[PDB]
Design a protein around this ligand. Structure first.
Ligand SMILES: C[C@H]1O[C@H](O[C@H]2[C@H](O)[C@@H](O)[C@@H](O[C@H]3[C@H](O)[C@@H](O)[C@@H](O)O[C@@H]3CO)O[C@@H]2CO)[C@H](O)[C@@H](O)[C@@H]1N[C@H]1C=C(CO)[C@@H](O)[C@H](O)[C@H]1O
Length: 646
């Protein structure tokens, strides 16, 4: 029940007001928790560690003396320490040097921890654990550019910084900034979804095993270099979203958030409930006031310090249903959902133009509706049914048996007030044990016939053609936003895989062969050219922000799908062999229609059969529930977008 959820949110928010002075003040914990050089040269420190017997600071700066700097036990399980400034006015904890919090347990155990609030952590050489590096650089980065105007419609480039080069190594923030952003802009994307930024010790977790929640991952470079990346993306008109992983945490205790104060509670729930058996991860105790301070402050942190334009919250389904659309009727974890409501509230009160996206597979209603209505407050959900339908079709059905009605139903079956992000394939489908669309479509011929020096075989023909069309149907019909994972826009060959046991720390597939699209002797350029033109076209006409399409034809015999959105006329011939010569298509208004996009074009790897100068007229002639009709010529496996120029 939604009246209850909102009464509950309102009560917790009211308390944050009466006890912490508002959610703004509340979410600024990072200003005192942690380690801070003060303006007077001393060092102020603070932790939450309710099960600790004692808390201490140690590191290079004091010769790893475990107990010479003990914190004072405060009310509510918190601890604070202030080291006086040195008489000789020199720095107490030098920039770049190592620290550790020391926790003494009820058992008399001596624990070494990285601060839950740590800015920066580095793994040195062949070491097992991460070190906590004090970060007090001489020159902080000054942001020089303002937020881009809020985009009418989101065209999202899903990105991972480490793999963004052709080299089998962890690529850098700097590399990304100089060499990848310009590419993302050139393609017509107006938003970047930045994966794997929150610190994670295990690279092959694809960024999902968080060890330090406030740390910009050190893999790629320094905190300053991330800021520059974000600042630079803004200068180019591109907005940047962060993957927020607040659904679970790595079981690491040496350099992770687990067992911080020697307990299995603290930031997490005690008992089996507080562990995620399949992910082997800890689960936050969202009911706990300090866990709300931590997570909400984390959101504020990413907003203020790195100037992100929004967030995608990963693992929302687990947050709601970990205890357990066959999801109707299940009991939701209202603690988790209240946190998400508070998060969204915070993000949108600080800036209404900020964007949040939920990764939720359950399709729970009201996740994307207003908080005042008992909803989660997300702007967007990912449309996860769509990648499934393409996989199903390609795996289980000859082309002659594809159902247009099923395709139209899956892409348009949406809740009217929920904006969602449509994409044709996920980052998960790009991984080792899986198949990409390009590979589903082309299998082994992807390694033999992607060169313009080889025959344009029927396999490669079909592959090139369907790749474009699947993307375009998804892009025009599927949602209120589009997403594309790094490389899939030009049909990147092979697969993605990270260094791990299973491959002897191989970086060989941990990269992106971006050069493939710059090679004129290869055929990737075709897929790439189409992507760029697809996005520039939407930028001009704005079909993502338009109401749902009016589907005029979902014809199973001819395999034709035709619809209107934002006034444009979309026509798909999915037939594996037949082409159509005087094919009548319904239209809303009469007049002269012209091709504005044609997948048969040569620059797209098409067959170049259409004359774009031919005028298409729709006269008053009723067809398929439309008051007007035009006649078009449309080949097998071609998509057309026609505009009314009257
Ligand atoms: C409302 C209050 O909740 C939180 O405080 C709790 C701690 O987080 C818990 O870990 C737990 O720790 C300590 C025991 O309460 C205490 O009896 C003692 O045995 O030490 C325990 C650990 O060694 O319990 C705390 C109370 O549930 C939260 O951290 C705290 O900030 C919250 N306090 C707010 C309320 C008021 C008055 O309305 C103000 O005085 C505070 O400034 C607020 O922060």
């Amino acid at each position: 029940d939604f009246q209850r959820r909102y009464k509950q949110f309102s009560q917790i928010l009211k308390n944050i007001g009466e006890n912490e002075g508002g959610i703004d003040k509340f979410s600024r914990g990072y200003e005192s928790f942690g380690v801070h050089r003060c303006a007077d040269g001393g060092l102020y420190c603070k932790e939450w560690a309710p099960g600790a017997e004692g808390v201490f600071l140690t590191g290079d700066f004091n010769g790893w003396n475990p107990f010479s700097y003990p914190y004072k036990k405060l009310d509510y399980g918190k601890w604070e320490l202030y080291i006086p400034p040195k008489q000789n006015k020199s720095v107490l904890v030098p920039h770049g040097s190592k620290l550790k919090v020391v926790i003494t347990s009820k058992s008399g155990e001596i624990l070494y921890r990285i601060s839950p609030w740590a800015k920066y952590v580095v793994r040195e050489g062949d070491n097992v654990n991460y070190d906590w590096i004090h970060w007090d650089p001489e020159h902080s980065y000054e942001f020089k550019h303002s937020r881009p105007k809020k985009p009418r419609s989101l065209r999202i480039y899903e990105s991972h910084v480490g793999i963004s080069s052709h080299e089998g190594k962890v690529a850098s923030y700097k590399h990304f900034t100089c060499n990848v952003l310009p590419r993302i802009k050139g393609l017509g994307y107006n938003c970047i979804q930045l994966m794997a930024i929150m610190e994670h010790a295990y690279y092959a977790s694809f960024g999902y095993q968080i060890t330090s929640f406030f740390a910009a991952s050190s893999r790629y470079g320094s905190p300053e270099e991330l800021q520059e990346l974000v600042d630079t993306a803004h200068s180019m008109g591109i907005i940047v979203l962060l993957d927020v992983v607040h659904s679970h945490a790595s079981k690491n205790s040496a350099d992770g958030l687990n067992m911080f104060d020697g307990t299995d509670s603290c930031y997490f729930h005690s008992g089996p409930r507080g562990t995620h058996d399949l992910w082997d991860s800890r689960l936050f105790a969202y009911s706990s006031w300090e866990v709300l301070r931590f997570l909400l402050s984390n959101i504020r942190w990413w907003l203020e310090e790195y100037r992100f334009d929004g967030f995608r919250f990963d693992g929302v389904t687990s947050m709601l249903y970990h205890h357990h659309s066959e999801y109707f009727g299940l009991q939701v974890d209202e603690d988790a959902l209240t946190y998400l409501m508070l998060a969204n509230h915070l993000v949108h009160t600080l800036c209404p133009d900020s964007i949040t996206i939920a990764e939720d597979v359950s399709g729970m209603p009201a996740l994307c509706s207003p908080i005042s209505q008992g909803g989660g407050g997300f702007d967007y959900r990912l449309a996860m049914a769509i990648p499934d339908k393409w996989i199903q079709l390609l795996k289980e059905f000859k082309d002659e048996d594809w159902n247009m009605g099923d395709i139209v139903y899956t892409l348009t079956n949406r809740r009217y007030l929920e904006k969602c992000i449509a994409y044709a394939e996920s980052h998960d489908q790009a991984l080792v044990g899986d198949k990409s669309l390009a590979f589903w479509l082309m299998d082994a011929e992807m390694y033999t016939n992607m060169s313009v020096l080889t025959p344009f075989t029927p396999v490669i023909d079909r592959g090139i053609q369907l790749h474009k069309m699947i993307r375009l149907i998804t892009h025009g019909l599927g949602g209120e936003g589009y997403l594309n994972f790094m490389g899939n826009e030009f049909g990147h060959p092979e697969w993605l895989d990270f260094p791990r046991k299973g491959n002897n720390e191989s970086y060989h597939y941990a990269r992106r062969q971006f050069h493939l699209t710059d090679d004129d002797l290869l055929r990737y350029k075709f897929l790439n050219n189409f992507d760029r033109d697809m996005n520039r076209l939407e930028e001009r006409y704005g079909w993502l922000a338009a109401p749902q399409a009016y589907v005029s034809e979902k014809h199973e015999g001819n395999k034709i799908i035709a619809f209107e959105r934002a006034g444009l006329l979309f026509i798909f011939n999915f037939h594996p062999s037949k082409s159509y010569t005087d094919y009548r298509v319904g239209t809303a208004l009469p007049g002269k229609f012209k091709i504005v996009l044609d997948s048969d074009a040569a620059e797209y790897g098409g067959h170049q059969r259409l004359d774009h100068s031919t005028d298409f007229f729709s006269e008053a002639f009723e067809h398929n529930g439309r008051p007007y009709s035009l006649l078009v010529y449309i080949p097998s496996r071609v998509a057309l977008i026609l505009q009314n120029v009257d």
